[PDB]
Write a protein that binds this DNA or RNA. Structure first.
Length: 95
RNA sequence: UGGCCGGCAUGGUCCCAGCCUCCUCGCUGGCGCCGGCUGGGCAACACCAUUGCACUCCGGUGGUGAAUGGGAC
């Protein structure tokens, strides 16, 4: 069951051998052109590794970034993108 | 040596270079042989497992079971 459009895009299948700080940076490097990015959450834990939440200011940006970067080779692996199941707190604190 | 002990072997103190290492990366650390016990930590590094939807940091195991020569007194 697919997901509905969201301010945040959920990315996975990311190279797990990359340190958190570097990954967030590199991610911003290739995603900031789709629109303002409020934040990028990355965790290296057993349950959260290989994934990331890029939180865009405007849903259109998440949408664009989703369609444009699906399958993009990143750190030797094809990035897999989706909309986040629910809203990130940073977003709730507003809309 | 991370912390502790035994056996053996071994002239000494320096100086240059090279190499070594999870546990004060370096010139007022170390770089003979052998055996036993044992602490911490995944921070880095490695290996294993993981395709996982968060907004609470948080899987496991491994390494020292290491590294040579030369020069002056």
């Amino acid at each position: 069951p697919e997901t509905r459009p969201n301010h945040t895009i959920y990315i996975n299948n990311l190279n797990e051998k990359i340190k958190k700080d570097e990954l967030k940076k590199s991610l911003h490097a290739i995603f900031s052109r789709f629109g303002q990015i409020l934040d990028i959450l990355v965790s290296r834990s057993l349950k959260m590794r290989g994934q990331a939440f890029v939180i865009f200011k405007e849903v259109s940006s998440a949408t664009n970034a989703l369609r444009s970067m699906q399958g993009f080779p990143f750190y030797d692996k094809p990035m897999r993108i989706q909309y986040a199941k629910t809203d990130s707190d940073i977003i709730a604190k507003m809309k």
